[PDB]
Symmetry: C5
Subunit: 311 residues, 5 copies
C-alpha cells in the first residue's frame, strides 16, 4: 500500500489522542518515567469509502496489514514502544479510527533547582515524517486526550495531562516532520523529606551548638566532629537520589551552607580552648556568649535569603 491521495492539493491531517492508563517509575537520576496508554489515530482515506446499503453494515473493520497506516513515532522514548493494535474502524466516507495500546519509557529532563519542592512538566512527543507523495500533519482531538482517575505516580501529585494543539512543523533530512507535545504536569510530594532528611539534619546541627554552653574542649570536639559526620551521611544519602546538576539545588544549598556552620563552630571551639589555655577565659567567654546568639541568628537569616533566592 501507499498514502491516501489528495482530493485537492492538501496535506494529510492525522488526528491524535493519548489516554493514560498507568504511569510509574519516575526515576530522578535517569530523568525518565514509564507510561502505559491508549494511542488513537484518525485520518481520511477516500479509497476506503463505501455504500452502507450494498454491504448492509454501518462500519468496516480491518487488520493493520490490509490498509495504509501513518507511521507515528515517539521522539523521546528510550527503546521504541511495545505496541498492540486494539481496533481499526472505517466509516462510510473513509474516515479511519485507529486505536492501539502501548507502553514506553519516556526520557524527559527535570529541573532540580527547587528539590524537593519542585514541580515538573513531563513531555511525550508524537511525530510523523512526510512522504514523497504527500505531506503529513498532526492534530489533537481533545475528546481523546485524558487519563483514568486511578492514575498515580508514587511520590508525586498528578496535576494535569494536556496537549499543545499546534504542531511544530519543521524540516529534517530534507523532509517535513510534524511534532506534537503532550504534557504531564506533576509536583513532588515533599512531605517525607521533612521527618526523614530536613528535621534529622537540623537536630544534629542544633546538638553541635550545645558546644557553646561548654568549656570542655574534649567534649566540644566530640560534639562538633560527631554531628559533622552525621551531616556527611545525610549529604551522601541525598546525592544518591539525585543526578549531578550543573546548578545548585535548594536542598543542596542548605546542605552545603551547613558545612560552613560546622567549620566556623570548630574554629570557635578551637579559639575558646586556645584562650582558656593562655589564661584568658574572659575573652573566650565573650566569643562563646556571642556564638550562642550569632549562630542561630546568622543561620535563620541565611535560610531566609536562600528561600528568597530559590522561591
Amino acid at each position: 500500500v501507499s498514502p491516501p491521495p489528495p482530493i485537492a492539493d492538501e496535506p494529510l491531517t492525522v488526528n491524535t489522542g493519548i489516554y493514560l492508563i498507568e504511569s510509574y517509575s519516575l526515576d530522578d537520576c535517569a530523568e525518565t518515567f514509564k507510561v502505559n496508554a491508549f494511542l488513537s489515530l484518525s485520518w481520511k482515506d477516500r479509497r476506503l469509502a463505501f455504500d452502507p446499503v450494498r454491504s448492509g453494515v454501518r462500519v468496516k473493520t480491518y487488520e493493520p496489514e490490509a490498509i495504509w497506516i501513518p507511521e507515528i513515532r515517539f521522539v523521546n522514548v528510550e527503546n521504541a514502544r511495545d505496541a498492540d493494535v486494539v481496533d481499526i474502524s472505517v466509516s462510510p466516507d473513509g474516515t479511519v479510527q485507529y486505536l492501539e495500546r502501548f507502553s514506553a519509557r519516556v526520557l524527559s529532563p527535570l529541573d532540580f533547582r527547587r528539590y524537593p519542592f519542585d514541580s515538573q512538566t513531563l513531555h511525550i512527543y508524537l511525530i510523523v515524517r512526510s512522504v514523497d507523495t504527500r505531506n503529513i500533519v498532526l492534530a489533537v482531538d481533545l475528546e481523546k486526550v485524558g487519563k483514568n482517575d486511578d492514575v498515580f505516580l508514587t511520590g508525586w501529585d498528578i496535576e494535569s495531562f494536556t496537549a499543545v494543539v499546534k504542531p511544530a512543523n519543521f524540516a529534517l533530512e530534507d523532509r517535513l516532520e510534524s511534532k506534537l507535545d503532550y504534557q504531564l504536569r506533576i509536583s513532588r510530594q515533599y512531605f517525607s523529606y521533612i521527618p526523614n532528611i530536613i528535621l534529622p539534619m537540623l537536630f544534629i546541627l542544633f546538638i553541635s551548638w550545645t558546644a557553646f554552653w561548654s568549656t570542655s574542649y574534649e567534649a566540644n570536639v566530640t560534639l562538633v566532629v560527631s554531628t559533622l559526620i552525621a551531616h556527611i551521611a545525610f549529604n551522601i544519602l541525598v546525592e544518591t537520589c539525585l543526578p549531578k546538576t550543573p546548578y545548585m539545588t535548594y536542598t543542596g544549598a542548605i546542605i552545603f551552607m551547613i558545612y560552613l556552620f560546622y567549620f566556623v563552630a570548630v574554629i570557635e571551639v578551637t579559639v575558646q580552648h586556645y584562650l582558656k589555655v593562655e589564661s584568658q577565659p574572659a575573652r573566650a567567654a565573650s566569643i562563646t556568649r556571642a556564638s550562642r546568639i550569632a549562630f542561630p541568628v546568622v543561620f535563620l537569616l541565611a535560610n531566609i535569603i536562600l528561600a528568597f533566592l530559590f522561591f
Copy 2:
C-alpha cells in the same frame, strides 16, 4: 474473523477466571508484584455449534487464529502479559472454553500507614472493550478462580484470592469497557522486624539513658551522640525498604519521635553540666533524678498514644 452475532439484542458475556500458580517479587518501593497464572475465558459462539451423535466427537479443538477470541487485556500490568495458549475447546451448543498461561508484573498501590504491621489488597484488573457489532461484558466463573496450595509470597501471609463478581461497566472514548477486580489479600510477616530493627533501636536508646546515672559530661556526650548516630543508621536503613509516602508510617513515627528523645537528652546532659560548672550540683542532681523516671515514662506513654492513633 468477526464477533458472534446476537440472537436477540443481548451483550456478549465473557466468563473469566484467574488461577494463581506462582506469586513472587512483592516490591514495596515499586508497589508491584509478579504473578504466574491461568486465565480462562468462556463465551457462546453459535457459528461454531455442531452435532455430537454424528460428528464422531463430543468436543472440537481449534487453534487461536481459526476462531474469534475476545481481546481481554489487563489494566494494571507494567508490560503486557507473556501469554501461552494451553487449550481451546468447543462444545456442541457452541460454548468455547479458552485457557492460557500467563505471567505479569502488576502495579498495585500499597498502604504503608501501619508498616510493618500492614495488610494489603492487591488488585488484578481484567478488561474488555466493546466492538461495533456487539457489546462485550465480563463475568466471573467462581469455579475457575483460585490458587494452588503452594502459592507463597516471601515475607507475606496469603489470606485469599477472590473476584468481585459485579463488573464495572463504563464508557471510555465513546465505547463500552467492562472491568473486573480480582483481589489478592495479603498481610506482612512483621516477625523479623522485631530482632532486626525494633529491638536493636530500643537497646541503643536505653543505652543513651544510662547518661542519667552519670555526672561525666565527656562520657554522657559520647553515650548520647554515639547512640544518636546508630539511630540515624537504622532510620536510613528503614527508608531504603520503603517508597516516600505523603503520610507518616507507624515505624516512621516511632523513628521520628525517638529523635526528639535524643535531642532532649542532649539538652539534659548540657543543662546538668552547666549547673555542675556553675557550682550548683544540687539543681543538676534534681533534673537528672527526674530524667531517670520522666524519660522511660514519657516514652512508654507516647508509644501508647501512637499505637492508639495508628491501630
Copy 3:
C-alpha cells in the same frame, strides 16, 4: 493435529528426562536459581509408525510443526522457559524421541533456619494437562536424568540431581494434571562466613570485654559503644544477604543474643562508675571481677544451648 488415540482405555505416558548443563545465580533473597538443561520427552504415537524395509530408513526425523507434541510446562518458573528444539526422532513402532534444550529462572523456597550451615532441596516441577480425548501422565526415564560433571553453583556444593519417579496426579479445573518433582540437592559453603562475619564479630565482642579490666568510665563507654556500632554494621550487612523470614535463623539468633551482651555490659560499666562515684569501689571491684568470668562463661553456655536448639 490432535493427540494419539488409545489402544484400550489407557492414559498416554510421556517419559521425561532433565539433564543439567549449567547451574547459576542462586539468589537467596529472591529464592530463585537459574538452570540451563536438556529436556527429553518420549511417547508412543501409532499414526507415525512405518515399515523399515519399504521406507529405506530405520528412523524418521520431523520438524515440531509436522507432528503432535505434548504440552509439557514447568510449574515454578518465573517466566515461561526459553526453548530450542534440538531433535525429533521417530522409530518404526511409532515411538517419538523429543529433545530440547532450555534455560529457566526457577522459584524454589529455601529454609534459612541453619544459615549459613544450611542445605537445600531445590525443585523443578514438570507438568502436563490432560486433553478431552485422552489423559496424559508423566514418567521418569532414569537413563535420561543427570548433570554434566562440570556443573557448579557458586557458593554451594552440588550433592545430587534426582527425580521422584511417581508423578503427583491431581485434578485442576476439572481436568487431570500430572506433576513431576526433579530435585537438586545442595549444601552451602559456609567457609567464607568464618573469616568474614563470625570471627570479626567475635573479636569486636571480646574487645568490649576489656572494659572489665578498666576503671575508666570514659574509656569503657568508648569501648562498649564503639564495638556495639561495629556489631550493628555486621547485623545490617547480614540482613542484606537474606530475605525476611517469619522464623529466627541460626546466625540471626547469635547476632540478636549478642545485643543483650552489649546491653548488660553497658549496665555493668554504668554500675561500676556509679559505685566508684558513691565512694564504694570495693562493691564495684567485686561486680567487675565477677563480670570477667560471668560474661565469657554465660556466652559460651548460651552458644551451646543455641547450637543444640538449631542442630
Copy 4:
C-alpha cells in the same frame, strides 16, 4: 536477491548518515552510553532504474524484503540494535534512499585521567563487509550527519557530533571490510563535584589541622582520627562512580595524597604528646608552631605540582 552488479569494475559506495534524536545513560563504570538516532543509507542499484515520463511517478517506494539492502552493522554495540525502517525511496536512475530509526547501547572507552575535569570522544563505528560478487565501501554524506538541538546527556556538555569522512578499509577473514568513525565529543559538568566532594573533603582536612592549636592529646586524636574516617567515606564514595583504572585519576591522586597528610598529622600529634610527657614542651611547641605553616604550605605546593602534572 544479490548485490547490484558493477558497470565498470567499481566497488559499491554506500553513503551513510547518523542523526542523533536522543542520547542518554552515560555509564562511567560500564564505559557505555545509549543513543537513539536515524541511520540513513544511499547507494546506486541500476536494476531498480525506471523511465520518469513512462512511469508518471517521480519516485518509487519499496518494502525492505523487496530489494537488496547492504548489511550495515555497528562494531561497538552491546546487543544488536533495535531497528525500525521508516522509508525506502528509489529515484529514476536507481539511487535508493534508505532511512531507519535505531537505538543502541554503545561501548566506548573513557579516559578518566582528568576526572572530574575530563572530556571524552565517544565513537560509533559503522561497518560493512564485502560480498563475493562485489566490494562494498562506506562514505559519509555530511548533509545527513547531525543531532537535534534538544540532545542532552545528563551530567555532560555535548560539544559536537561529526564523522571522519574517510573510511578505514581493511581485510578481515579474507573479505574486505569498510569501517566509519562517527564521533560524539562531550565534556563533563564538574560543577556538582565542588559542593559535593571537593569542598566537604577540604573542610574535614582543615578541621584536622586545628590539632596544631591544641595541646590536648585525647582531643587531637579524636580530631585527626575522626576526620580520617570521613576521608575514607569520601574515597569509598568516589571509587563507586568510577571503574578501576591502571592509572591514577586527578581526584584519585588528590584523595591518595590527603592520606599522607593525615598520617603525618598523626605522627606530629604523637611526637607533640611524647615530648609533653618527657617534660619538654618547648621542643613540642616548635614542631607544632612549624606544623601550623608547613601543613597548609606543603599542601598548597603539592596541589600546584599535581594540577601541573595532570593539566
Copy 5:
C-alpha cells in the same frame, strides 16, 4: 531438512572459528563475561553442488531456512545466544561458508586465590550433537580464530584468544557430542587496589601503632578502636567485589590477619593500663617498648610467609 549423506563412512566435519569484536562486563561475583563476536562455520554438503555455467554465478547465496545448517550451540552461555546471520556462501563443490555474528553472556569459573594479582582462563565451549543419519565432529580453522586489536576488558589485560584444536568427543544420552574449547587468557590490573585499598588499609593500621608511644589509655582506646572500625569498612567493601569462596584469597588472608593485630593491640593497651593503675609502670613500659618493635616485625614476617604460601 536432514544432514548431507556420507561418501564413505566418515563423520561430518564442521570447521569453526570465533573472532572477538568486543568483550565487556567481567562480573567477578556472577563469574561471567560478555562477548560480541563472529562465529564462522564451514562444511560441505554435496547436495548443494552446482555447475557455474548452467547457474550463471561462481558462488551461491542462501537464507538459513533454505539449506541444512548444523545445530552448533554454546555450552556455558547464560542466555542462549542472540544471533544474526551475515552471510551463507556455497561454492560449486557444495562447500558451505557460514558467518554469523553473535553476543553472549558466558559463565566461566574464576580462581580468586591470588586476588587482586590473579590471572584467569575464560572458556567459550562450542558443541554439536550427532544425528541418526551421521556423526558430526567439530574442528578449528586457525585462520578464522582471533580478536580485533581494539578488544579491551575494563580492569583487565587481554593476553590471548586461542582454541584447543582437538575436540572433546564423548557420548551423552546415547548420542555423540563434539565439544570445542576457545580460551581467552586475561590478567587483572591490580594497580588501583594499591592507592584504593592496600595503602589506606596499611595507614590506618600504622596509626593504631602510635598507641605504643602513648601512656594515655583513653587516647589509645580511641586510636585502636577507631582504626579497627575503618578496617571493618575496607573488609566489607572488599567482600562486595567478590563471591564467597570455599578458600582464602590473598587479600582476604591479609585482611583477616590484620584483625589479629588489632585484637592483640587492644590486649597490649589493656595490659599497659592495668599495670599503670596497679602502680607498676616499669613492667608496662617494657611491654610497650617491646611492642614498638614486635608489632612491625611480626607484621612484616607474617606478610612474607603469606606472600610465599600464595605466590
